[PDB]
Point group: C2
Chain length 91, copies 2
């Protein structure tokens, strides 16, 4: 499991445009949102992983930081989830 | 090992922004290193301490937002790929 998390400027309209362009690129590459600015994708082997990361490099935004972490599916399923308004209640 | 905290907190209102700084401060106080605006990490030398860290984050959680806590090896953390934004048509020094 490949995790892409990024820290991009959001001050200007052009910053925000550039943010949306990079997000759409990730979506277009099969990445799913885990939370804001954090996306993940299962990969079958490390060749596929390296190729994903190379494509991120070629499509990176003009400013900001993008980091790529690779973990096992077990490590990912053991992630602790903490939600502020935690209760589940229907109307 | 390393504990990575990914947080997605609202910043729409003044209360949201205050609570954002409170949580970030709690992470600093706790010895987490900022990695990105919304991603902090801490070296863990003893797996016993991991469960203690998670319980503390749970007790100190902000009133709204998503906090996800991932445990990875030192090697996975050291080999993270760091990609720096750059224009496709940047001038070179």
């Amino acid at each position: 499991r490949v995790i892409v998390f990024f820290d991009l400027p959001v001050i200007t309209p052009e910053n925000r445009h550039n943010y949306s362009v990079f997000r759409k690129y990730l979506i277009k590459s099969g990445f799913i949102m885990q939370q804001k600015s954090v996306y993940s994708k299962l990969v079958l082997n490390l060749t596929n992983r390296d190729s994903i990361v190379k494509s991120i490099e070629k499509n990176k935004p003009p400013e900001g930081l993008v980091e790529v972490l690779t973990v096992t599916e077990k490590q990912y399923a053991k992630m602790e989830i903490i939600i502020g308004e935690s209760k589940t209640e229907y109307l």
